[PDB]
Amino acid sequence: SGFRKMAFPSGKVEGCMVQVTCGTTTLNGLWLDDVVYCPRHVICTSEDMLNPNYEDLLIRKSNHNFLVQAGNVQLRVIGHSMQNCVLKLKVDTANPKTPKYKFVRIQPGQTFSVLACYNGSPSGVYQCAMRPNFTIKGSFLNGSCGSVGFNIDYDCVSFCYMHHMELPTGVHAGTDLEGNFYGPFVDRQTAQAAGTDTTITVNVLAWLYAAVINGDRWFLNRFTTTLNDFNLVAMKYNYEPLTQDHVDILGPLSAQTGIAVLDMCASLKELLQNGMNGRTILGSALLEDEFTPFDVVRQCSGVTF
Amino acid sequence: SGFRKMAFPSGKVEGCMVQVTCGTTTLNGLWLDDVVYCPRHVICTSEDMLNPNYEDLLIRKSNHNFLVQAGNVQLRVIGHSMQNCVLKLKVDTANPKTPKYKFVRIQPGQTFSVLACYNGSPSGVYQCAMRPNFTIKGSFLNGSCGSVGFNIDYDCVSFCYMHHMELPTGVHAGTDLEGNFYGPFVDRQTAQAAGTDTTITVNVLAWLYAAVINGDRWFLNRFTTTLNDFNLVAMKYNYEPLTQDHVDILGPLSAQTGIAVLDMCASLKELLQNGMNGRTILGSALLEDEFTPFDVVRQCSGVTF
Numbered sequence: 001s002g003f004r005k006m007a008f009p010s011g012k013v014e015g016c017m018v019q020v021t022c023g024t025t026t027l028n029g030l031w032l033d034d035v036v037y038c039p040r041h042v043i044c045t046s047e048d049m050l051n052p053n054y055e056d057l058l059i060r061k062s063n064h065n066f067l068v069q070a071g072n073v074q075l076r077v078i079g080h081s082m083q084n085c086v087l088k089l090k091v092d093t094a095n096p097k098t099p100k101y102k103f104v105r106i107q108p109g110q111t112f113s114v115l116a117c118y119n120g121s122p123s124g125v126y127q128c129a130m131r132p133n134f135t136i137k138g139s140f141l142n143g144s145c146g147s148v149g150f151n152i153d154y155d156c157v158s159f160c161y162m163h164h165m166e167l168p169t170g171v172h173a174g175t176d177l178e179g180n181f182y183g184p185f186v187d188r189q190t191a192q193a194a195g196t197d198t199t200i201t202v203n204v205l206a207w208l209y210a211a212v213i214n215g216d217r218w219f220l221n222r223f224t225t226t227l228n229d230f231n232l233v234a235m236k237y238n239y240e241p242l243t244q245d246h247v248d249i250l251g252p253l254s255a256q257t258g259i260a261v262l263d264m265c266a267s268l269k270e271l272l273q274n275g276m277n278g279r280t281i282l283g284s285a286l287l288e289d290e291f292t293p294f295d296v297v298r299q300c301s302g303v304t305f
Numbered sequence: 306s307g308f309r310k311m312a313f314p315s316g317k318v319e320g321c322m323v324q325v326t327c328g329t330t331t332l333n334g335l336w337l338d339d340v341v342y343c344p345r346h347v348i349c350t351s352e353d354m355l356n357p358n359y360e361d362l363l364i365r366k367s368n369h370n371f372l373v374q375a376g377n378v379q380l381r382v383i384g385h386s387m388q389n390c391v392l393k394l395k396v397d398t399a400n401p402k403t404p405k406y407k408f409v410r411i412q413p414g415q416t417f418s419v420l421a422c423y424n425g426s427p428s429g430v431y432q433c434a435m436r437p438n439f440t441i442k443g444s445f446l447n448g449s450c451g452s453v454g455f456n457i458d459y460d461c462v463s464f465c466y467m468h469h470m471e472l473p474t475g476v477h478a479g480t481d482l483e484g485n486f487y488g489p490f491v492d493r494q495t496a497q498a499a500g501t502d503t504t505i506t507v508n509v510l511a512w513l514y515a516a517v518i519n520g521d522r523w524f525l526n527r528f529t530t531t532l533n534d535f536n537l538v539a540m541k542y543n544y545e546p547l548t549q550d551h552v553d554i555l556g557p558l559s560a561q562t563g564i565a566v567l568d569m570c571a572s573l574k575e576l577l578q579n580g581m582n583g584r585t586i587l588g589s590a591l592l593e594d595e596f597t598p599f600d601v602v603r604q605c606s607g608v609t610f
């Protein structure tokens with residue numbers, strides 16, 4: 001028993017991290033087979049960052065201008081190309097530590113692990129959610145770009161995020177591994193704002209089921225609700241609408257605990273209208289929305305990779 | 306910017322995890338050089354667990370009774386011995402993935418990462434604190450014993466915890482890698498209770514400095530306090546006494562922000578006496594005590610391994 005914010009084991013991704021330096025700027029890259037993926041702004045100087053023309057800057061760079069290091073070993077670059085906001089550097093050596101992998105584009109509300117890196121070396125791993133406004137609440141400093149986010153399924157690493165930038169509220173934005181940004185953001189130093197965020201309702205419900213599984217049951221009430229009436233309340237508290245797809249995805253936790261989803265909705269409705277009155281759920285004084293139904297099942301059932 | 310509960314990268318420890326089975330019970334083991342370390346209760350059956358005589362049970366076991374698997378590969382056991390509450394199984398093959406390592410016994414208030422494993426395979430990584438009552442708030446299921454806790458310093462893994470058991474409140478207890486329990490616990494299925502816990506004051510202060518570094522400064526007041534007067538307040542709210550050693554350890558964060566430790570103590574005293582009035586600090590509605598000063602510096606300065 002117990003419930004923690006748990007990240008995926010990071011070893012498979014650690015063996016793919018490299019350092020990419022072009023001129024004076026060094027960021028991280030992801031080395032898979034004979035290709036290194038990194039943010040395109042590695043080719044910018046400080047003056048270039050207000051409004052860079054990346055295609056122009058890349059035209060003036062040749063393979064040898066890219067210094068790629070894997071540990072203390074230089075990897076020789078033999079080709080380069082730009083795909084959306086990422087550079088693909090072909091190297092003359094395939095990474096022998098390349099895991100089975102896929103590039104996926106995750107949906108808002110889904111979670112992943114981030115392996116935060118500097119100079120191609122890992123500093124830590126934490127779990128994040130793709131927010132409804134297409135930002136993540138991460139922890140990233142200068143030099144962290146090219147750090148990646150990922151899920152693991154058995155032996156397969158699904159890379160879903162590459163880190164590019166920080167937005168005024170202390171929140172983070174990036175691309176999938178094809179270089180397309182999540183959200184309406186661009187890779188330039190100009191004023192950009194995230195849309196208003198919203199609470200991921202299906203995830204709060206998943207975490208309430210995690211609490212029941214752990215014996216923290218005080219908030220269960222005796223009522224039920226309709227899906228339509230729940231959503232009228234959710235709306236006022238800035239919660240996403242709950243869909244029938246979300247109800248189905250909560251099926252395994254509902255079946256395990258014997259609490260119908262609409263009954264858990266009635267209990268959540270009460271928490272939203274009345275507060276927690278100084279109580280905690282799973283140790284938290286606020287309702288938590290960064291665990292998916294799958295995360296709850298995986299942690300409470302001991303799924304391994 | 307941003308502040309997350311961040312675990313160490315787990316790859317170095319992942320390459321050491323193995324499965325140990327004796328009879329019907331399977332737990333995890335730690336394979337370093339030619340030795341596998343695991344909890345001694347792998348040799349118990351269900352009937353044995355109320356009050357096992359481990360020395361007696363081990364006398365009746367020979368090397369071949371221990372089935373050790375590293376992935377799909379059986380490792381042949383060639384010797385066995387018991388050290389306190391851990392078994393040491395000598396195997397005929399040294400682990401080629403053994404990192405530089407040390408066995409350390411950590412002090413209450415210190416943090417570590419746990420790599421939770423089942424059947425020798427990792428399921429997730431999370432950060433934990435050794436509580437003042439010598440328990441940890443983890444997330445562990447049947448089969449998780451032998452999962453380890455660790456810190457990393459550059460290239461060196463300091464193993465400090467091996468998981469053995471769960472106590473009535475949903476909290477966890479274990480040993481160092483020499484098999485000595487943290488706390489007054491024994492490895493048997495009998496009623497055991499943890500002492501009353503207390504809040505790790507130096508860590509709350511460290512996290513308040515993390516908040517200042519991130520721009521969350523609303524709680525800073527205009528006052529100072531003496532160390533003695535702060536401790537009189539801390540006492541009433543079940544906080545550990547702050548010592549001059551703790552004040553010195555907070556020196557780097559104090560110097561970085563220009564806030565004297567005793568001035569931050571005055572601000573904490575106000576939070577304890579008055580509450581947060583529905584506000585949050587770094588997103589949390591409760592004061593957080595599972596970040597050490599070192600964790601704050603490492604995360605806010607981008608320390609890598």
Ligand SMILES: *C(=N)[C@H](C[C@@H]1CCNC1=O)NC(=O)[C@H](CC(C)C)NC(=O)[C@@H](NS(C)(=O)=O)C(C)(C)C
Pocket residue numbers: 027041049140141142143144145146163164165166167168172186187188189190191192306
């Ligand atoms: C990548 N190494 C770095 C990560 C930032 C640095 C501080 N915290 C982070 O997450 N990315 C940047 O510095 C990017 C670079 C451009 C070309 C996208 N710039 C920013 O993130 C910028 N924010 S913005 C796009 O102007 O609103 C900063 C530097 C003002 C944070």
Ligand SMILES: *C(=N)[C@H](C[C@@H]1CCNC1=O)NC(=O)[C@H](CC(C)C)NC(=O)[C@@H](NS(C)(=O)=O)C(C)(C)C
Pocket residue numbers: 001332346354445446447448449450451468469470471472473477491492493494495496497
């Ligand atoms: C190790 N695999 C297992 C980990 C437990 C299982 C549930 N959550 C955990 O953390 N450890 C045990 O089952 C130990 C075994 C003995 C010999 C120490 N037993 C317990 O943890 C026991 N608690 S106790 C010592 O009786 O208070 C349980 C099974 C009642 C939780």
